[PDB]
Design a protein around this ligand. Structure first.
Ligand code: PXM
Length: 388
């Protein structure tokens, strides 16, 4: 039987990713609510997240398969509560780094949220039940942003009370996380009867190239998903004009989900398609970041974020569909854990070079040209593959 754990897990997802303060965070921490300058949020505060998503990845995943997936989801709920309490009632550059630390632990426990399904659902309904739950998170986000923007452009509700709605939502998410069914078996440690198995893990080359491209694409997308709000703030300030970040980010998540659904029905020969369409949409992403660095009208930057998130979600759903062909249940999660680790090492190196203060200390103007060049180098590796 699988109805009730699916219901409790989907309620946790739909009230966990229902954060209306998530689009309007950079007009919040740069407005009169918290006196933090843009250089501080760009260079001294946000990179901590990437740091706190590397160091907190490898233990938490091992805490994921050891205490059977429940106290790490309860830890995600407590992390939600502490993070949005510190966003509501924290002032100073000390506190916002602590916000980024607990939110890195949130994003680390997100994989533990997506890995809960394979412990209480029977192996008949692995594809169906998970096929609902992830969609619920997107359904929590898009409408979760619309309830943001339709409460800002129509009611003049404060950003503080937008964060208050976020805190109440993650509190409901934590109260649904307390009534979770404690499962019985894990996937690796408490599985019913791996150093020497590693050659058995990586006895391929197709997995290697799709995993390396997944790693670079995930690092680039996480960096752009960090700093696109600071780019939106720099192209048009929040105090000057009534910016529409919630509606654009909701439409962007919607277009990404529809693009992934379109990837799910591609009846094209893969050896005939993947040599061209991958390169074409990589050039589309590179041109999107080139557009967001070059322009001055903020509407061109909104269109750039729309096209970038949609084309990325297309390419990364192609990546997941290629990687998940021959893998088992354990192989899928193990290989994606190691690839997420490689992606966060690459993202941490690129953040230490570019974004962070003791480094190049580049502002948000130079950064998006650097990330357009990053996706262009990925497309150049694909072009050299097209020579091969
Ligand atoms: C809480 C939080 N902090 C920082 C960032 C990076 O801008 C994000 C965006 N994922 C976020 O949700």
């Amino acid at each position: 039987s699988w109805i009730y754990p699916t219901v409790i897990l989907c309620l946790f997802g739909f009230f966990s990713m229902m954060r209306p303060s998530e689009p309007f965070l950079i007009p919040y921490l740069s407005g009169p609510d918290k006196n933090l300058t843009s250089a501080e949020i760009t260079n001294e505060i946000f990179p901590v997240w990437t740091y706190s998503y590397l160091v907190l990845l490898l233990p938490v995943f091992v805490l994921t398969d050891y205490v059977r997936y429940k106290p790490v989801i309860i830890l995600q709920g407590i992390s939600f509560i502490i993070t949005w309490l510190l966003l509501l009632f924290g002032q100073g550059v000390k506190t916002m780094q602590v916000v980024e630390f607990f939110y890195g632990m949130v994003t680390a426990a997100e994989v533990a949220y997506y890995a809960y399904i394979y412990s209480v659902v029977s192996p008949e309904h692995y594809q169906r039940v998970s096929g609902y739950c992830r969609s619920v998170t997107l359904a929590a986000y898009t409408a979760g942003s619309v309830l943001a923007q339709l409460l800002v452009s129509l009611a003049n509700m404060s950003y503080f009370y937008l964060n208050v709605i976020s805190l109440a939502s993650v509190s409901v998410a934590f109260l649904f996380s307390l009534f979770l069914p404690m499962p019985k078996k894990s996937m690796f440690f408490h599985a019913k009867p791996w150093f020497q198995d590693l050659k058995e893990c990586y006895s391929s080359k197709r997995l290697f190239y799709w995993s390396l491209w997944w790693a670079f694409a995930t690092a680039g997308f996480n960096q752009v998903l960090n700093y696109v709000q600071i780019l939106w703030d720099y192209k048009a300030p929040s105090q000057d004009s009534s910016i529409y970040n919630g509606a654009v980010e909701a439409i962007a998540t919607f277009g990404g989900a529809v693009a992934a659904f379109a990837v799910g029905y591609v009846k094209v020969n893969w050896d005939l398609l993947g040599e061209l369409a991958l390169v074409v949409f990589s050039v589309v992403n590179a041109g999107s970041l080139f557009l967001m660095h070059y322009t001055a009208n903020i509407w061109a930057c909104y269109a750039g974020y729309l096209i970038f998130k949609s084309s990325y979600m297309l390419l990364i759903t192609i990546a997941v569909f290629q990687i998940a062909v021959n893998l088992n249940v354990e192989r899928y999660a193990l290989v994606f854990g190691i690839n997420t680790f490689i992606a966060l090492v690459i993202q941490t190196i690129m953040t230490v070079i570019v974004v962070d203060q003791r480094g190049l200390n580049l502002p948000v103007s130079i950064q998006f040209l650097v990330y357009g060049s990053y996706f262009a180098v990925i497309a150049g590796i694909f072009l050299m593959r097209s020579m091969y």
